[PDB]
Amino acid sequence: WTATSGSCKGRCFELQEVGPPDCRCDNLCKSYSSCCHDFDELCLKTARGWECTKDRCGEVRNEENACHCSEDCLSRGDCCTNYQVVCKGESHWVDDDCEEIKVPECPAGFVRPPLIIFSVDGFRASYMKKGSKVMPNIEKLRSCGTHAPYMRPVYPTKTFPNLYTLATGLYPESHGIVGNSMYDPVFDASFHLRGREKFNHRWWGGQPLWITATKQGVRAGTFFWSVSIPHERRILTILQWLSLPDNERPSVYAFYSEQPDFSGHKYGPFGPEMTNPLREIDKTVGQLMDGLKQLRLHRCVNVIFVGDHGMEDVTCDRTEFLSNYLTNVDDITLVPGTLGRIRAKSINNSKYDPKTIIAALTCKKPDQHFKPYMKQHLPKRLHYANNRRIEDIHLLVDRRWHVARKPLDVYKKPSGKCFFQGDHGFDNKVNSMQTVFVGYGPTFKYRTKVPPFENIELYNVMCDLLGLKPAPNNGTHGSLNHLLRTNTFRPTMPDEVSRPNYPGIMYLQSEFDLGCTCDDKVENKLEELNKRLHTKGSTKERHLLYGRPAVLYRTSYDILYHTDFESGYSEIFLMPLWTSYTISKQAEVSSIPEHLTNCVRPDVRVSPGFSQNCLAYKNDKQMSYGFLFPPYLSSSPEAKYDAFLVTNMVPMYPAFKRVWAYFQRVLVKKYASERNGVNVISGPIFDYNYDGLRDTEDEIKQYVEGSSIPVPTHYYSIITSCLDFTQPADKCDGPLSVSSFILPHRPDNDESCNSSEDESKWVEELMKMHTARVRDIEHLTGLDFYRKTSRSYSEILTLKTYLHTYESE
Ligand SMILES: *[C@@H]1O[C@H](CO)[C@@H](O[C@@H]2O[C@H](CO)[C@@H](O[C@@H]3O[C@H](CO[C@H]4O[C@H](CO[C@H]5O[C@H](CO)[C@@H](O)[C@H](O)[C@@H]5O)[C@@H](O)[C@H](O[C@H]5O[C@H](CO)[C@@H](O)[C@H](O)[C@@H]5O[C@H]5O[C@H](CO)[C@@H](O)[C@H](O)[C@@H]5O)[C@@H]4O)[C@@H](O)[C@H](O[C@H]4O[C@H](CO)[C@@H](O)[C@H](O)[C@@H]4O[C@H]4O[C@H](CO)[C@@H](O)[C@H](O)[C@@H]4O)[C@@H]3O)[C@H](O)[C@H]2NC(C)=O)[C@H](O)[C@H]1NC(C)=O
Ligand SMILES: O=C(OCc1cc(Cl)cc(Cl)c1)N1CC[C@@H]2CN(C(=O)c3ccc4[nH]nnc4c3)C[C@@H]2CC1
Ligand SMILES: [Ca+2]
Ligand SMILES: [Ca+2]
Ligand SMILES: [Cl-]
Ligand code: NA
Ligand SMILES: [Zn+2]
Ligand SMILES: [Zn+2]
Known part of the structure; x- marks a missing residue:
């Protein structure tokens, strides 16, 4: 119940959300059917349209008009946005040359540049190129400001999960808006596009930007706009808020457009009917910029032009x-x-x-x-x-x-x-789902292209732009410092929590009762001295190119050095947390020799009590084992023995070994050929509770039968080379290039419908689907990689958030 015969007089687009017995006048009152009786009359005036004409210039202020062309209108903050152009000889902002904005040029009384977020629903990334001729205002923002070729949305690529991720920096799984429609079994309640339930506080988790601002003393404009408020009124309302006194004026605003999404559903992403909606969006941007220019704010405000997702051709028949x-x-x-x-x-x-x-x-x-x-x-x-x-x-x-x-x-x-001819919601690496990002203003860089990045990163940046400390979120703060002229965030590397042991030779062969055998008793002071050096770390600078990963949790582990690979071996999980090795362009692939097919060798640096055992694998009729450093890539027949150490072994289902063997035997060498050497770091992942975070030992739901050997849920690898591929991976002078994956450790290959065929027809497709960011691996392992490079830490954070998507342009 709403007592709606209160009044909106002096309250139009009020910023605080009034609770009963009061009528509401905020930009969402229509949605709740809660507006005062006079809301339309007072707040949604339309008389005489939205543009000044020569006849109106210098008019007597008439309060019924939608916007004003009177002499007093600038002081009042309510001129039509084209007032100075029509009445005062000024030019439209779009016809002005761009000029670098090195510093904010703001009216007296502004304590920080405001931020305006111009969000556009369904604005597919390729619209920036394909609609360029009909969008001159947006093209000006794009070319004069900082832009990405595209920005990756979160999955599902629907509107509510993506707009709320933009506001929070959180994955939908964490903020709780996991779809446009949802059933929560704990509440026993359903969230729907139509209806009242979606407005309940209990759906919306994390802390959205407007709350982060308010809590830290920064006023926010309201983010949500009722569908029937025309876009011109939305613009004039923001412009009016921007004219409020200093103590009342918000510092952050959002505009939202239902287009081009709305038409895109009807006509498809590139239906001929799509030109008009794009022209009309462009015109609204022009109205905002002309309006800011009249108020002398066009070189003061930071503007972000961002979409929530793209739009694909989809029809009934499909x-x-x-x-x-x-x-x-x-x-x-x-x-x-x-x-x-x-x-x-x-x-x-x-x-x-x-x-x-x-x-x-x-x-x-x-x-x-x-x-x-x-x-x-x-x-x-x-x-x-x-x-x-x-x-x-x-x-x-x-x-x-x-x-x-x-x-x-x-x-x-x-x-x-x-x-319907268009829709969206698909996997967020799909090209048609990509969306846009442009930032323009004194805090953003000038005429600068940045690489594609994910929308979870923007919340941190919008906090930097506003001087706010962000709530805890899934962005990697610093990873977008390259978009900014100033207000960069300078993080420090996380501190190492566990220091490693470096065990030497401490056990005799006969102390191991593991059920393992190896034909390795075949038999020199040069060669004995050299093997000792290799076990002491003499080749570590070849195989550990970016420093040892730091272990960010409390645990017991050993660094183990070898000719061809170095590893960080967990005494708790009985296998490496990481194995690191470098493969040059010219490396030779060899086989596992026949006499070594079933070879597993005890590691005399590591206690029997901290080792796996072969008897458990023999007893476990479902589980086999593979090796993290691949024997196929050993530098010599003698080095190859190291690859069969029990400390290099990991539990693998036979169906998974088809995957892993093809990766190790065929693909690593292919990448090394293509990229001029690669450095590989591989390892197990345990995520039995599917929260994206490293399990503690008491979370593991499956062990090799009879044993304490935990079974990984996934295997990762991070493959790094020189971005300038004319330099070999191990002698790279500049920026790095990376691709990674997180493969599920499954006991069948049902995921791959073609898996009865040779691995060359299905394994790489599987790996591509399971592409990952280094940062994803970090969350899953509690490791921090790239600790010792000669690159700026911000550039390394960018690298860690990179995702190799395998889509074309
Ligand atoms: C992406 O980024 C996010 C954000 O960093 C990461 O998300 C965080 O992940 C943490 C680890 O999983 C998790 O820590 C939890 O927190 C529990 C307390 O949680 C409630 O309070 C949160 C804080 O609110 C306040 O935040 C700001 C500033 O920090 C304040 O100014 C305000 O006052 C805020 O109120 C709150 O955010 C959180 O929200 C979640 O839950 C709501 C209701 O369910 C949802 O509406 C909301 O959407 C959030 O939902 C997500 O998170 C929950 C898990 O919390 C998840 O179930 C949902 O599916 C969804 O994913 C809460 O309201 C705390 O109780 C936990 O501590 C227990 O577990 C740990 C380890 O497991 C124990 O060591 C600890 O002792 C304790 O154990 C006890 O309880 C156990 C389980 O009940 C029990 O078995 C045991 O025996 C013990 O009794 C734990 O610390 C964060 O809450 C979470 N934050 C968010 C927003 O999600 C995320 O990991 C990142 N993802 C990746 C891949 O990196
Ligand atoms: O004004 C809006 O948000 C602004 C905003 C900006 C930023 Cl930066 C962050 C945040 Cl948190 C909010 N709202 C008003 C309109 C809503 C109804 N919708 C649909 O009815 C709809 C649309 C497109 C659709 N495509 N397919 N179904 C659809 C349903 C969308 C909803 C978006 C929310
Ligand atoms: Ca077995
Ligand atoms: Ca976990
Ligand atoms: Cl199989
Ligand atoms: Na299959
Ligand atoms: Zn949308
Ligand atoms: Zn849509």
């Missing part, structure tokens, strides 16, 4: 139906569309079984346009599992496709008439 796969389709509830999420229709159904649903949806048609996953098996780069609002069963849908439960759902009720 729908897969679960009714074609499941006999039990009525027993499940599907969140449908460009992703799928499945749960039981009834929690009282004891015959609902997720393993059999998954199996019925796996590789059933040769052209199948979705792939089912338990959520913990989704590519770790999606960060889409650690929330009870994310169903256990997920369907990753192919770009251009939809999934639905039954055909009736599509031509009846919500799935639009078969009139």
